[PDB]
Homo-oligomer: A and B are copies of this chain.
């Protein structure tokens, strides 16, 4: 069967500049785990 699984969006992968925030989810018709990523920036690098 299918049991829903979605993680929280991660902290930004980099402490300065552009990094990624990542989660995983099976919220799709095949109920398979996939990754999602979004750009993030905590602060600019000096």
Contacts and interface: CB of A to CB of B under 8 A. Distances in A.
Interface residues of A, number: 13
A1 B4 CA distance: 47
Nearest 9 pairs between A and B by C-beta?
Answer: A18-B28, A29-B44, A18-B34, A17-B30, A37-B37, A36-B39, A30-B45, A34-B39, A17-B29
Interface in A1-46: 17-18, 28-30, 32, 34, 36-37, 39, 41, 44-45
Interface of A: 17-18, 28-30, 32, 34, 36-37, 39, 41, 44-45
Contacts of A29: 17, 41, 44-45
A37 to B, nearest CB: 6
